[model samples]
Target: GSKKIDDDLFEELEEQLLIADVGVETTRKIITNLTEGASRKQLRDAEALYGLLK
Candidate 1:
């Protein structure tokens, strides 16, 4: 399945991470990795990203 990447999705993910007390730097790293994976076409969408986390 194809899913468009967008700022709103990232923002929502970031907000949840922050609310969970996941450190800023760690959250940034997670976002960065997901971004890179998306750029490489390794991830299909946010749902796939959730599976890849950790």
Candidate 2:
């Protein structure tokens, strides 16, 4: 239910988000926003981040 933020996981997530027909810069922006939220403990886990994206 919980996972630490890591490079590989973050990279893959960003790639997948990009593949969903979004622009590269916009995807990066989304990733960055969620990443910051995670770092600040504003999000609980990957699921929460995914929810925010959706």
Candidate 3:
């Protein structure tokens, strides 16, 4: 399963991150990390891809 993120998705993610009490710098970092993490995955729609963070 492929996730086709739209242009406004970041705006929504930003709001979600903010609501989660994530700081600006940290939020940006996390977003970048997540994006990169997803991009580096072996397969699309891999739920356990985020486990690479650990």
Candidate 4:
């Protein structure tokens, strides 16, 4: 989880959320939001990027 927001983070989420039976669409939207946060040039580490959600 170091620095967060790596491909592994999303990939791990993909698996866990999927297994958690989150609707595929919902989880996908979450991923997109996270991606958008990152793409928005927040330039923050994984922690802060997720903090955007908070």
Candidate 5:
């Protein structure tokens, strides 16, 4: 396998720790948001998802 999309997505998402300085807890919150959104088929990829960050 090429690795699960969730984790590969997480790899890309991991950088927001430095981007926002929000730490794992907060970033993990956003990660969960991505999870649910993706589960419900709302958001696209990770980089595109950050648009709603504001």
Candidate 6:
């Protein structure tokens, strides 16, 4: 299963990255990775993001 992309998802990720003060390029990269993860059926849980930070 994968985390599907939706307006809510995009908004959440965008606000989150922005609040964290992440630069546009870096935030874009992170968002792209998330999108690709969804496409590949790899991002199944929201908690999985903690792993990315670590």
TM-score against native, each model: 0.35, 0.35, 0.35, 0.34, 0.33, 0.35
- Between candidates 4 and 5, name the one with more favorable lDDT: 4
Candidate 2's C-alpha lDDT? 0.79
Residue 18, candidate 1: C-alpha displacement in angstroms: 14
RMSD of 1: 21.0
lDDT-wise, the better of 2 and 5 is 2
User: Roughly what TM-score does model 2 have, to 2 decimal places?
Assistant: 0.35
Per-residue error (Å), model 6, residue 46: 19
Model 5, which residues run further than 4 Å from truth? 1-22, 42-54
Question: Each model's C-alpha lDDT?
Answer: 0.81, 0.79, 0.79, 0.79, 0.71, 0.78
lDDT (Cα) of model 3: 0.79
Residues 1-54, candidate 6: write the lDDT tens digits.
Answer: 897777998899889988776677778999999999887665456557656883
Model 2 regions more than 4 Å off? 1-22, 42-54
Enumerate clash totals for all models, in the order shown.
Answer: 0, 0, 0, 0, 0, 0
Estimate, for each residue in 5-51, the C-alpha lDDT of model 3 and write its tens digit: 88698999888988776577778999999999878774655757665
lDDT of 1 by residue, 3-54 (tens): 8899999999989988777677778999999999877775456557787756
For candidate 2, the per-residue lDDT at 45 reads: 71
Instruction: Give the clashing pairs for model 6.
Output: none
TM-score of 3: 0.35
Cα deviation at 36, candidate 1, in Å, is 0.5
Residue-level error in angstroms, candidate 4, position 25: 0.6
Between the candidate structures 1 and 6, which one is better when assessed by lDDT? Answer: 1
Query: What are the per-residue Cα lDDT tens digits for candidate 5 across 1-54?
Result: 585467767876777656666566687889999899877665355557776685
Pairs of colliding residues, candidate 2: none
* Cand. 6 Cα-lDDT: 0.78
